[PDB]
Scaffold this active site. Structure first.
Site, mmCIF file in Angstrom:
data_model
loop_
_atom_site.group_PDB
_atom_site.id
_atom_site.type_symbol
_atom_site.label_atom_id
_atom_site.label_comp_id
_atom_site.label_asym_id
_atom_site.label_seq_id
_atom_site.Cartn_x
_atom_site.Cartn_y
_atom_site.Cartn_z
ATOM 1 N N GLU A 11 0.793 -1.240 0.000
ATOM 2 C CA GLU A 11 0.000 0.000 0.000
ATOM 3 C C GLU A 11 0.806 1.261 0.000
ATOM 4 O O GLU A 11 0.239 2.303 -0.378
ATOM 5 C CB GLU A 11 -0.938 -0.009 1.177
ATOM 6 C CG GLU A 11 -1.964 -1.109 1.173
ATOM 7 C CD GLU A 11 -3.028 -1.000 0.092
ATOM 8 O OE1 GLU A 11 -3.061 -0.024 -0.666
ATOM 9 O OE2 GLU A 11 -3.817 -1.956 -0.014
ATOM 10 N N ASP A 20 -6.118 6.239 -5.007
ATOM 11 C CA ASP A 20 -5.658 4.864 -5.054
ATOM 12 C C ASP A 20 -5.755 4.330 -6.499
ATOM 13 O O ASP A 20 -6.071 5.023 -7.444
ATOM 14 C CB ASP A 20 -6.411 3.992 -4.037
ATOM 15 C CG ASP A 20 -7.812 3.598 -4.356
ATOM 16 O OD1 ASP A 20 -8.456 2.926 -3.526
ATOM 17 O OD2 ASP A 20 -8.289 3.950 -5.455
ATOM 18 N N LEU A 32 -8.593 3.993 2.765
ATOM 19 C CA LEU A 32 -9.653 4.516 1.878
ATOM 20 C C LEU A 32 -10.486 5.506 2.649
ATOM 21 O O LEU A 32 -10.990 5.211 3.748
ATOM 22 C CB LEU A 32 -10.511 3.377 1.383
ATOM 23 C CG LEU A 32 -11.685 3.760 0.473
ATOM 24 C CD1 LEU A 32 -11.242 4.447 -0.815
ATOM 25 C CD2 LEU A 32 -12.498 2.488 0.189
ATOM 26 N N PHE A 104 -8.292 -6.242 3.422
ATOM 27 C CA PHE A 104 -7.858 -4.866 3.507
ATOM 28 C C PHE A 104 -8.073 -4.159 2.156
ATOM 29 O O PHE A 104 -8.473 -3.008 2.126
ATOM 30 C CB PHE A 104 -6.423 -4.868 3.986
ATOM 31 C CG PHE A 104 -5.873 -3.514 4.297
ATOM 32 C CD1 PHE A 104 -5.749 -3.123 5.623
ATOM 33 C CD2 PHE A 104 -5.415 -2.643 3.329
ATOM 34 C CE1 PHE A 104 -5.173 -1.915 5.954
ATOM 35 C CE2 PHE A 104 -4.879 -1.424 3.630
ATOM 36 C CZ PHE A 104 -4.763 -1.058 4.952
ATOM 37 N N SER A 117 -12.589 -20.234 -4.521
ATOM 38 C CA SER A 117 -11.234 -20.117 -3.992
ATOM 39 C C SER A 117 -11.178 -20.398 -2.497
ATOM 40 O O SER A 117 -10.230 -21.063 -2.038
ATOM 41 C CB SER A 117 -10.637 -18.736 -4.245
ATOM 42 O OG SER A 117 -10.432 -18.490 -5.621
ATOM 43 N N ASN A 132 -7.333 -20.460 -9.255
ATOM 44 C CA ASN A 132 -8.653 -19.898 -9.222
ATOM 45 C C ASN A 132 -8.689 -18.428 -8.808
ATOM 46 O O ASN A 132 -9.448 -17.613 -9.351
ATOM 47 C CB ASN A 132 -9.565 -20.732 -8.330
ATOM 48 C CG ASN A 132 -10.995 -20.331 -8.445
ATOM 49 O OD1 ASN A 132 -11.503 -19.561 -7.604
ATOM 50 N ND2 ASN A 132 -11.671 -20.774 -9.470
HETATM 51 CL CL LIG Z 1 -9.917 -22.539 -11.507
HETATM 52 RB RB LIG Z 2 -2.086 2.436 -2.192
HETATM 53 RB RB LIG Z 3 -8.007 -0.395 3.094
#
Ligand SMILES: [Cl-]
Ligand SMILES: [Rb+]
Ligand SMILES: [Rb+]
Ligand SMILES: [Cl-]
Ligand SMILES: [Cl-]
Ligand SMILES: [Cl-]
Ligand SMILES: [Rb+]
Ligand SMILES: [Rb+]
Ligand SMILES: [Rb+]
Length: 164
Positions: A11, A20, A32, A104, A117, A132
Site C-alpha cells: 500500500e 488509489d 480509503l 484490507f 477459492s 482460481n
Molecule cells: Cl480454476
Molecule cells: Rb495504495
Molecule cells: Rb483499506
C-alpha cells in the site's frame, strides 16, 4: 515479515490525500476515505477519522494509527464473517496474512464472494486455489500485488515479499 510489513509494501505510505489504484481518495497506508468524487467529502472523512482539522494532510504517527485500526478491524471482521472465519481459522498464520491482505484491499464482502477459492483454500488445495484466485477482476487490475498475495497462499512462505 508480518501483516503490517506486508501491507506497508503493498500500500505504500503517503501523508497527503491521493487517489488509489481505483481512483478513490485515500491517505496513509491504504486508508480509503471515500468513493465519492468530491475531494471535500474525502477531506471531511479524514478530519472525522483523525479528530482534527487536517485539510488533507496527516502525520506519519497518524497514518500508522489508522493503519493499525484498519488491520485490527480486518481481522476482527473476518472472525465475525460466517464465510471467512472458518477459512481463516483453518489457515496457518502466514496464509492468514494473505487473507487479511485481500480483505484490507477489497473489503469483507468482496473476499467472501470468492466462494470457490475459499473452498480450495479450506481444502488445502494450494495450487488449485492459486489458479482460481487469479481468475478475477482483482488480479487483472492489480496483477503484481495479487501475484504476491497468491504466492503467499500457494506456498505459506514470505518468498514474494522478501526483500521488497
Ligand atoms: Cl480454476
Ligand atoms: Rb495504495
Ligand atoms: Rb483499506
Ligand atoms: Cl476510520
Ligand atoms: Cl493443489
Ligand atoms: Cl499491482
Ligand atoms: Rb475529484
Ligand atoms: Rb489458524
Ligand atoms: Rb459467491
Amino acid at each position: 515479515m508480518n501483516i503490517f510489513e506486508m501491507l506497508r509494501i503493498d500500500e505504500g505510505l503517503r501523508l497527503k490525500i491521493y487517489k488509489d489504484t481505483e481512483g478513490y481518495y485515500t491517505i496513509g497506508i491504504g486508508h480509503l476515505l471515500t468513493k465519492s468524487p468530491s475531494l471535500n467529502a474525502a477531506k471531511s472523512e479524514l478530519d472525522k477519522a483523525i479528530g482534527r482539522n487536517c485539510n488533507g494532510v496527516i502525520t506519519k504517527d497518524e497514518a500508522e494509527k489508522l493503519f493499525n485500526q484498519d488491520v485490527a478491524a480486518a481481522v476482527r471482521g473476518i472472525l465475525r464473517n460466517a464465510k471467512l472465519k472458518p477459512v481463516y481459522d483453518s489457515l496457518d498464520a502466514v496464509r492468514e496474512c494473505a487473507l487479511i491482505n485481500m480483505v484490507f484491499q477489497m473489503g469483507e464482502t468482496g473476499v467472501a464472494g470468492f466462494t470457490n477459492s475459499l473452498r480450495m483454500l479450506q481444502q488445502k488445495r494450494w495450487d488449485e486455489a492459486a489458479v482460481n484466485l487469479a481468475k478475477s477482476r482483482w488480479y487483472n487490475q492489480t496483477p503484481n500485488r495479487a501475484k504476491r498475495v497468491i504466492t503467499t497462499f500457494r506456498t505459506g512462505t514470505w518468498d514474494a515479499y522478501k526483500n521488497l
